[PDB]
Nucleic acid binder design. Structure first.
Ligand SMILES: [Mg+2]
Ligand SMILES: [Zn+2]
Ligand SMILES: [Zn+2]
Ligand SMILES: [Zn+2]
Lengths: 98, 39, 783, 244, 168, 270, 81, 111, 146, 65
RNA sequence: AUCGAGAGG
């Protein structure tokens, strides 16, 4: 009953890469870290004018898609504006064994 | 790119006082792990 | 260290690996582009000139082509700059640097190379695409995965080196590791899981499904087995079809907790003559365990047959699983209502207990434990309560999971997963910890700015009440992140530390070898061990066996080993022998029986002195028990008929075997004495295993079967003896260095009777190998 | 890789005709192994999928923001309202036979990221090529047609295997090999090998007769010469005088 | 602590006994304490158990502790490998470490010693002391491309005169 | 299998849909038919693009890729020579269809380039093929790309004959629904459940076409799979009924070809 | 010495490996084969046949720690393994 | 890079006949037939119909590896019933049923 | 077909589907021969059972093919599909299983027990004191009349 | 960057629905879910092709070359 | 050619 301040929103403790993870608090810690590294490795549109600038090694997805499930942080990181991946349909199952 | 712009290279554990100031999850794997932190 | 001890080499390749269940254990899928690139200087002879001239005609643009041709003059003909593909006539003695062909022997490995198993020879299979393809089961020794791992090829150039690899480094030959005295390869991932499901009691297979499964087995003899059920429907059990993969003559009996040879649980394991008889097949049976199928087959049939076993089982099971299916999802992590209520009650109860103690500690009523302070006594007791709570909650969830639960099934099979994984996903994640402690007060008298000062209530110091399913709350999340951080750190540090340690051991023992005198020596010729391993035998041929005479009461021993033809108390039942009525009262045979028994009594005395803890299970060469079973089956030992064995023949037969075991072959008393000592335990095993009653009542063998057993034991024993030239130095160094990489304990997480604040894991290993004068934890045990 | 630190590579690709399918004719784009879950405990990965399906069916954006009041039960309720199994399991058929699979499959939309690192820019193989001028030893680097390093650990294992002739081949025949003449009197590489008149002469020992040829790795030659550079002799003898 | 004790029946029966686990080591005095069984006292110090009892006791204890470390995580390594290690570390009558002050301080071939840690610091000594390297070790033949003794190179395949005749 | 089998019943039908009840057939055939419709029916599609002018945002091959996915009238595809069997060099009107695309940002506003803007140049010889399939109620068949005022695009396309096994671009099936044993009577699947599978699993729409199983019934182990519910779609290049008929024809030809092979060997045998 | 050979009478896996390798090499060098080539063209397979029939014309010099040695012929050695 | 040609999924190559019939040695009246450039889209039909023939003792198939469009078929029959002819009969049977399928669909469609 | 190793009638005292959806553990006792109890795992899904049911249980050993005695086709030689059920065949039972043998456990000499097993489904028959016909030979066809 | 011609998972042409899709959202002001339904996009494996599409080409055309 | 940085395993 002596509170002096209040967090604007718990999720703000996360950084850029961490904030694009779905339900971070339902993963084992190390996995969120691993994703933080993976996010940096993803392909996608970097700069809108990438066609103008000449550079060494650009990796542009043909058809970038929004994350069907997003975090509110993406509103400020403009991830929806410049996403990096696709909404693939997946099946978690043992099949041919490959 | 944003991960560079918010990058803080220390010259290695998640100290309690990091709460809210640097990201708990974001860190390099091995070597500089725990030393390079992101805001 | 840079250019001499290690160096860059030609005739090599590197790329990403991917799994391929349709390859044989000892095969490797090599991309056409690599097969085209790398070459081999095959010599032109009267037995291959036909093929080689065709390869020249094919040119250097085919995955069955060739490149440079070497003349006797030493000239190298570059086929990329030649219009004489069909004009060049090869002469005998020339060489043709052809492309890599199927079944070529190549050396294949993964970095870092921690042990022999990381370097194995495979048979090349030229494939499309651009990854190396591997049989799932070979990744276990490589320590490989398919998340982007890369492997190296080293291609032999001389005929001598091809032979050397194919006869020494071939995968099949590495199935049983000398490191831990067990198999290092086995059935894992999907196949392992699939097998469990396949061999379940309720698994029955339709006719046409069976026809395909049988066809998949490469070694199927074309004989369709009669179905378990013949009337209403011709159905085959999963056990029946799987057993087709297993070779004839194989016997195995594990026998688990509640196994009764009829248990409704279908636990344990019984295999007779290659036929699966009883028990669900799981990790314990077809895993890397040395008490399982993989080991037995390797020993009984050999490396070549066992390699086929891997292929046979995988092809059948993977096919069956393909047409069955196996998945997993969120529902598998969800416990029902009642269960979750009990979980929250368990957590709440523990919290109450922690609170009660907290109050007592605050009230200065809590008494310090011996050997520690009051404050840490409190800390200790609280952690204990919270750990117990986590586990109890986990068990509540576990117990109430249905057999349908896919996660549960993977855990039951033993293919990825464990109790704690279920417990954390479905129930309490548990108390987080940093450096073996609860979350420390990084702020003044508190862990976060969200708590008041001086508050030790479970959750304030890292206790997580929620499951991964339920989700962690901000504070729990952060505390969890802190625990995760130190974990990540340790996984980095330990590779630097164990990498160094491993190298030091290998270098230290680099030149330790078994010489032709059977003595272990270094470069200087200094004797390390007069007899390698204090027995002179190869670890790869050692199996854990039971020394029956060590245990049991003296009375029980007498009942099982004393024979007295002069007194009815221990006289053999006449019906045991064809002449069992003639031996009655035969003092001369009684003398031999007295000799035998006397020795067996001495054996108890001796072994009681050697193994004071009473342990009867020890690693000894030659699984005699299994040998006996082979005789019982091979000769159709009818246990209702009197045998033609003679007591004299049994006693002297066994004694003769002992004399013909050999290890050393010198004539000097020094060597002869060493020989007598070298085989003491094995002889104790022989005597305890092949006693008169054991041979006549328990193992009612015929003279033919009995003689066969003795000659069989001899042959196998000789095979178990270590070969000269063996690099036991490096081998031991790798054997000790490798598994050290699994020590993530550091100082705790091993438990004991006293306050175990004892340095362990890698930290302790370093103290030992460095011979530190100031160890962190001295401790003296006084009795 | 997914958004949950779940990496992987494409083991094999199948045409739609050969892959599992739902009653509705929906065929997976990417099949993930069940064994990749239970040990990693990436529950969020599973949740994202469930939520994503609801989002696709309802035609809106899902909210996976960390610390909210969104629960699995809420999500599953919505899914059941769309006529699908509440926990995301769907009955699928075997693409090969068309027979209904015995186990139902957790199936739905998710989000994967194509990562940098492609086998086409990693695969490497070379048989003879550019060697470093210093040590005459295959150069370093995939892009420069370099060789692969047979490291200390790799030769250690060959020793453990007992592959003595293999090491000789890989350490000398597969790179670094040099014929050098050694003076029998003083085991130094000072012989003037006049390989055209068969004249030798040690000079300093005046040995024009008792010399021998050694097949040795060029790098080892450099070692010995670099020792000579420090006024230290490494006298190589071909006749063991110290019998025992 | 519990311990199996061969009962009067001949069969081992688990019995309990009081054991005093102390913090610190001082065998020189503890062993003489009245009421204590001086033959069962066991420490963690190799140096102290060696100095008090001897190199064989030290070596035996060395094994036991190596064993404990490996066994502490539930893993298993064959006795034969662990025995070899501790035997090598105690061939000199003391405790030889695996460091440059243990392994490198030996009488073995100079071309092998220098491959571990110290390099010219060893080669300079070899030069000044006119050390002769017998070249029958491993590294000695690695560092010059010869078929080192070991495995297929531990013997020499040849046709002698007797067998030549027998092979015709 | 002797003619008195496949009883085809149609529940619903439209230009791009045929809802089937195929009873009295072998499951293997029901599936084989499903599979052959998916990937062994020949269609017409752009398989080569010549880029003359491209000052647009999109990459040359990016556009070429998109063009190959545009569905072309393939009604008379059987009258078009399969390119692999065409002895005529490169290509010709007998085995290919040539289309061109010309666009320029005449307006200052974004100019849209549509598949409707493709123009057939080669001689169709009266064969009903090549015409870009337009099912857009606005007439604007598939958007190829957007175009800025000062930009220009000029392409020449060559469409060929092929099947989905070669590339997904050739498929016409789109999607095929397939289900049998609405009510789990054959026990081909064991429903996963956390309480009551009868309530947890959604009842299939096909269940209304078969009487519910009784709890007093014994497992009818003699029963076989039969009565397959299917719904074949179409991308528009081939009338949905032709997708099915031609799929069936394909299987007949496939079996006939191995039958022929058997005959050929017997002819070559003594 | 000829007699009193203290080393094993069995052929070791290392001896076998090198014997086959060196013999196979000779075969690949177009040396005369002492067994019937029953469709055998692979030097190694050919060598293994000779090993089985003890036709391989080789002697193993087993060096002992002190520099001495024992000569054993292929025919004398017991090719079990 | 080193990806295979998609034409190899259905077009016969050089020296590749459509069928190759080998005789089994593990059992009497049994053969193994190799189908080139042909997966179980067709293969599964063949097995299914073979198992409807009461004179066939064994009928099964397998695709040894998915990288290659090849199909192994094993057929065992009773004495006198040459497995080759058994297959020929299965083909005739399948075609006849397909003919009816087409006819019934076309009629149902028209109506 | 040609012979019988055992022939008696049992009444089911208990049925236990220990976490099984098809197979139940049957505990039955022989009528008349009160020294002979029978334990049996049976595919209930395929062949329905109930407590207190009286079943006729035999073992036999005649390889039940098609013509007069133990024809090899069932044991040793590829098993032939049905069709020949229209020939000499002991198919007048409502359930048939082909099994094997473990060991003739001897219980308290006067008491009785015998070997057993059907591809994973187990049994335990306390067959009469003699069991002389009931040979160790694994060939066995548990025949049950409903 | 323009809408994928054909659904990745089906081959169902959705490259002619984008324009009208936006109209349903703007001119008609419908919920995205109902708009997708109005387009005939029954299967969620096709709905996602439009639902999560990012029209970047409009941004690219803002540059003058 | 060295030198540092970013990563991958
Ligand atoms: Mg990996
Ligand atoms: Zn000189
Ligand atoms: Zn043409
Ligand atoms: Zn779709």
């Amino acid at each position: 009953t002596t509170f002096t301040h209040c967090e604007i929103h718990p999720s703000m403790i996360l950084g850029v890469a961490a904030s694009i993870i779905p339900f971070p608090d339902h993963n084992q810690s190390p996995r969120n870290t691993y994703q933080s590294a993976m996010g940096k490795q993803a392909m996608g549109v970097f700069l809108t004018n990438y066609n103008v600038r000449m550079d060494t090694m650009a990796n542009i997805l043909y058809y970038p898609q929004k994350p069907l499930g997003t975090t509110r942080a993406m509103e400020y990181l403009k991830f929806r504006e410049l996403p990096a991946g696709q909404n693939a349909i997946v099946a978690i199952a043992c099949y041919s064994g490959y | 790119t944003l991960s560079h712009l918010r990058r803080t290279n220390t010259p290695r554990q998640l100290h309690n006082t990091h709460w809210g100031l640097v990201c708990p999850a974001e860190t390099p794997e091995g070597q500089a792990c725990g030393l390079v932190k992101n805001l | 260290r840079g250019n001499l001890m290690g160096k860059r080499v030609d005739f090599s390749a590197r790329t990403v690996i991917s799994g391929d269940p349709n390859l044989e254990l000892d095969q490797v899928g090599v991309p056409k582009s690599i097969a085209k690139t790398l070459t081999y200087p095959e010599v032109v002879t009267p037995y291959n000139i036909d093929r080689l001239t065709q390869l020249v005609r094919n040119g250097p643009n085919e995955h069955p082509g060739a490149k440079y041709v070497i003349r006797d003059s030493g000239d190298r003909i570059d086929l990329r700059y030649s219009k004489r593909a069909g004009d060049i006539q090869l002469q005998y003695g020339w060489k043709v640097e052809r492309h890599i062909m199927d079944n070529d022997p190549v050396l294949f490995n993964r970095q870092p190379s921690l042990h022999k198993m990381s370097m194995m020879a495979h048979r090349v299979k030229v494939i499309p695409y651009s990854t190396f393809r591997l049989n799932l089961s070979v990744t276990s020794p490589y320590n490989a995965d398919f998340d982007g791992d890369e492997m190296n090829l080293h291609v032999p150039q001389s005929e001598e080196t091809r032979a050397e690899l194919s006869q020494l480094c071939a995968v099949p030959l590495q199935i049983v590791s000398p490191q831990s005295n067990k198999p290092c390869m086995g059935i894992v991932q999907d196949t392992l899981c699939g097998i469990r499901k396949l061999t379940l009691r309720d698994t029955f297979i339709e006719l046409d499904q069976v026809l395909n499964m049988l066809y998949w087995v490469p070694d199927w003899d074309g004989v369709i087995p009669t179905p378990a059920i013949i009337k209403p429907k011709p159905l085959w059990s999963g056990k029946q079809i799987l057993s087709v993969a297993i070779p004839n003559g194989i016997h195995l009996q594990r026998f688990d907790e509640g196994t009764t040879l009829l248990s409704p649980k279908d636990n344990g394991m019984l295999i007779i003559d290659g036929q699966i008889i009883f028990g669900v097949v799981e990790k314990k049976t077809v895993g890397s365990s040395n008490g399982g199928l993989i080991h037995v087959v390797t020993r009984e049939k050999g490396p070549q047959v066992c390699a086929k076993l891997f292929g046979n089982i995988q092809k059948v099971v993977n096919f069956w699983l393909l047409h069955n299916g196996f998945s997993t999802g969120i529902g598998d992590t969800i416990a029902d209502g009642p269960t979750m209520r009990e979980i929250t009650e368990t957590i709440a109860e523990a919290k109450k207990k922690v609170l009660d103690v907290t109050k007592e500690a605050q009230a200065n009523l809590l008494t310090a434990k011996h050997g520690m302070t009051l404050r840490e006594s409190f800390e200790d007791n609280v952690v204990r309560f919270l750990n117990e709570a986590r586990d109890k909650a986990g068990r509540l969830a576990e117990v109430n999971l249905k057999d349908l639960n896919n996660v549960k099934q993977m855990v039951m099979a033993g293919s990825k997963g464990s109790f704690i994984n279920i417990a954390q996903m479905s129930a309490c994640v548990g108390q987080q910890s940093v450096e073996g402690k609860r979350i420390a007060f990084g702020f003044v008298d508190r862990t976060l700015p969200h708590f008041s000062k001086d508050d030790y209530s479970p959750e304030s110091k890292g206790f997580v009440e929620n499951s991964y399913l339920r989700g962690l709350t901000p504070q729990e999340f952060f505390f969890h992140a802190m625990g995760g951080r130190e974990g990540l750190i340790d996984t980095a540090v330990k590779t630097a530390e164990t990498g160094y340690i491993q190298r030091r051991l290998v270098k230290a023992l680099e030149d330790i070898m078994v010489h032709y005198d059977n003595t272990t020596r270094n470069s200087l010729g200094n004797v390390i061990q007069f007899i390698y391993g204090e027995d002179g035998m190869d670890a790869a041929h050692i199996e854990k066996q039971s020394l029956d005479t060590i245990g049991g009461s003296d009375a029980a021993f007498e009942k099982r080993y004393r024979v007295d033809l002069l007194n009815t108390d221990h006289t053999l039942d006449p019906s045991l022998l064809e002449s069992g009525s003639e031996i009655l009262g035969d003092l001369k045979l009684q003398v031999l029986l007295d000799e035998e028994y006397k020795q067996l009594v001495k054996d108890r005395k001796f072994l009681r002195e050697v193994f004071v803890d009473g342990e009867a299970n020890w690693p000894l060469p030659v699984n005699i028990r299994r040998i006996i079973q082979n005789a019982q089956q091979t000769f159709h030992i009818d246990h209702t008929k009197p045998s033609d064995l003679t007591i004299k023949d049994i006693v002297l037969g066994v004694k003769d075997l002992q004399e013909n075991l050999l290890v050393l072959r010198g004539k000097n008393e020094i060597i002869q004495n060493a020989q007598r000592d070298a085989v003491t335990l094995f002889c104790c095993l022989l005597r305890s295993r092949l006693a008169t009653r054991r041979v006549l009542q328990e193992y009612r063998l015929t003279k033919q079967a009995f003689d066969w057993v003795l000659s069989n034991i001899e042959a196998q024993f000789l095979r178990s003896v270590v070969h000269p030239g063996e690099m036991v130095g490096v081998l031991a160094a790798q054997s000790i260095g490798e598994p050290a990489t699994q020590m993530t304990l550091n100082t705790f997480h091993f438990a004991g009777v006293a306050s175990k604040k004892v340095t362990s894991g890698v930290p302790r290993l370093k103290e030992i190998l460095n011979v530190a004068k100031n160890m962190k934890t001295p401790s003296l045990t006084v009795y | 890789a997914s958004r949950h630190g779940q990496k992987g590579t494409i083991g094999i690709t199948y045409r739609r005709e050969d892959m599992p399918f739902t009653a509705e004719g929906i065929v997976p784009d990417l099949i993930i192994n069940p064994h990749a879950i239970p040990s990693r405990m990436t529950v969020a990965h599973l949740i994202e999928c469930l939520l994503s399906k609801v989002a696709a069916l309802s035609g809106n954006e899902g909210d996976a923001s960390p610390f909210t009041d969104i629960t699995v039960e809420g999500i599953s309720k919505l899914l059941r309202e769309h006529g699908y199994q509440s926990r995301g399991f769907e009955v699928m058929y075997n693409g090969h036979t068309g027979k209904k699979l015995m186990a139902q499959i957790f199936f739905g939309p998710t989000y994967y990221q194509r990562l940098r690192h492609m086998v086409d820019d990693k695969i490497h193989a070379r048989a003879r090529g550019p060697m470093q001028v210093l040590t005459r030893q295959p150069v370093e680097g995939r892009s420069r047609d370099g060789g692969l390093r047979f490291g200390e650990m790799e030769r250690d294992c060959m020793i453990a295997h007992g592959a003595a002739s293999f090491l000789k081949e890989r350490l000398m025949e597969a790179s670094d090999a040099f014929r050098v003449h050694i003076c029998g009197i003083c085991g130094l590489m000072t012989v003037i090998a006049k390989l055209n008149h068969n004249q030798f002469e040690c000079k300093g020992c005046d040995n024009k007769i008792d010399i021998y040829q050694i097949h040795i790795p060029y790098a080892a030659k450099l070692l010995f010469q670099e020792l000579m550079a420090m006024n230290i002799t490494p006298r190589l003898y071909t006749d063991r005088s110290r019998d025992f | 602590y519990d311990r199996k004790v061969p009962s009067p029946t001949g069969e081992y029966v688990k019995e309990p006994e009081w054991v005093l686990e102390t913090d610190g080591v001082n065998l020189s005095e503890v062993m003489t304490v009245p009421g204590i069984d001086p033959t069962r006292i066991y420490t963690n110090s190799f140096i102290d158990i060696m100095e008090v009892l001897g190199i064989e006791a030290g070596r035996a204890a060395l094994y036991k502790e190596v064993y404990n470390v490996i066994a502490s995580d539930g893993s298993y390594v064959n006795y034969r490998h662990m025995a070899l290690l501790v035997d090598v570390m105690t061939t000199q009558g003391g405790l030889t470490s695996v460091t440059r002050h243990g392994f490198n301080r030996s009488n073995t071939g100079a071309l092998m010693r220098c491959s571990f840690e110290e390099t010219v610091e060893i080669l300079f000594e070899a030069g000044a002391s006119a050390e002769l390297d017998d070249c029958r070790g491993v590294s000695e033949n690695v560092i010059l491309g010869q078929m080192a003794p070991i495995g297929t190179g531990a013997f020499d395949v040849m046709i002698d005169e007797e067998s030549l005749v027998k092979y015709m | 299998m002797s003619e008195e089998g496949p009883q085809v019943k149609i529940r619903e039908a439209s230009k791009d849909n045929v809802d089937f009840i195929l009873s009295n057939v072998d499951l293997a055939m029901a599936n084989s038919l499903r599979r052959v419709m998916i990937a062994e029916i020949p269609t017409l599609a752009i398989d080569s693009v010549e880029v003359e002018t491209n000052t647009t945002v999109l990459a040359d091959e990016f556009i070429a890729h998109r063009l190959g996915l545009i569905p072309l009238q393939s009604m008379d595809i059987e009258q078009l020579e399969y390119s692999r069997d065409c002895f005529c060099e490169d290509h010709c009107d007998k085995c290919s269809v040539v289309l061109t695309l010309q666009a320029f940002g005449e307006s200052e506003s974004t100019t849209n380039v549509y598949s409707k803007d493709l123009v057939i140049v080669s001689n169709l010889m009266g064969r009903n093929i090549g015409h870009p399939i337009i099912q857009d109620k606005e007439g604007n068949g598939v958007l190829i790309c957007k175009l800025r005022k000062g930009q220009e695009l000029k392409l020449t396309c060559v469409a060929k004959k092929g099947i989905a096994k070669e590339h997904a671009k050739w498929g016409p099936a789109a999607a095929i629904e397939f289900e049998y044993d609405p009510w789990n009577k054959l026990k081909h699947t064991d429903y996963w459940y956390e309480q009551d599978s009868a309530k947890e699993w959604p009842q299939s729409k096909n269940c209304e076409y078969e009487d519910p199983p009784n709890e007093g019934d014994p497992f009818d182990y003699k029963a076989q799979a039969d009565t397959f519910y299917m719904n074949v779609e179409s991308v528009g290049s081939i009338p949905v009924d032709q997708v099915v008929v031609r799929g069936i024809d394909t299987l007949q030809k496939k079996v006939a070809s191995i039958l022929l092979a058997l005959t050929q060997m017997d002819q070559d045998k003594v | 010495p000829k007699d009193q050979r203290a080393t094993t009478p069995y052929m070791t896996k290392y001896e076998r490996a090198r014997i086959l390798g060196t013999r196979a090499l000779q075969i690949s060098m177009n040396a005369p084969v002492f067994v019937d080539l029953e469709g055998e063209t692979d030097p190694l397979r050919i060598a293994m046949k000779e090993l089985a029939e003890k036709k391989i014309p080789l002697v193993i010099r087993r060096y002992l720690p002190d520099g001495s040695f024992e000569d054993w012929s292929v025919e004398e050695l017991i090719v079990d393994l | 890079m080193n990806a295979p040609d998609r034409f190899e999924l259905f077009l016969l190559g050089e020296g590749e006949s459509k069928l190759k019939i080998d005789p089994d040695t593990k059992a009497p009246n049994a053969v193994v037939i190799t189908f080139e450039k042909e997966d179980h889209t067709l293969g599964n039909l063949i097995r299914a119909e073979l198992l409807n023939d009461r004179k066939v003792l064994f009928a099964a198939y397998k695709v040894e590896h998915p990288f290659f469009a090849r199909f192994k078929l094993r057929i065992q029959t009773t004495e006198g019933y040459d497995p080759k002819d058994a297959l020929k009969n299965a083909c005739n049977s399948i075609i006849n049923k397909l003919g009816a399928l087409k006819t019934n669909f076309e009629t149902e469609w028209n109506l | 077909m040609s012979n019988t190793l055992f022939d008696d009638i049992f009444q089911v005292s208990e049925v236990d589907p220990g976490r099984y959806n098809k197979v139940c553990r049957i505990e039955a006792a022989s009528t008349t021969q009160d020294q002979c109890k029978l334990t049996l795992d049976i595919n209930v899904e395929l062949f329905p059972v109930a407590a207190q049911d009286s079943l006729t249980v035999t073992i036999a050993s005649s390889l039940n093919l098609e013509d007069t005695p133990a024809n090899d086709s069932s044991a040793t030689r590829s098993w032939r599909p049905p069709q020949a059920g229209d020939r000499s065949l002991a198919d007048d039972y409502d359930y048939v299983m082909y099994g094997t043998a473990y060991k003739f456990e001897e219980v308290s000499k006067d008491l009785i027990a015998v070997y057993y097993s059907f591809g994973g489904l187990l049994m335990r028959l306390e067959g009469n004191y003699r069991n002389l016909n009931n040979l160790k030979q694994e060939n066995a066809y548990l025949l049950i009349r409903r | 960057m323009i809408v994928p011609v054909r659904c990745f998972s089906c081959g169902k042409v959705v490259g002619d629905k984008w324009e009208s899709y936006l109209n349903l959202l703007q001119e008609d002001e419908l919920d995205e879910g109902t708009a997708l339904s109005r387009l005939g996009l029954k299967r969620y494996c096709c709905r996602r092709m439009i639902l999560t599409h990012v029209d970047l080409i409009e941004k690219f055309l803002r540059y003058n070359p």
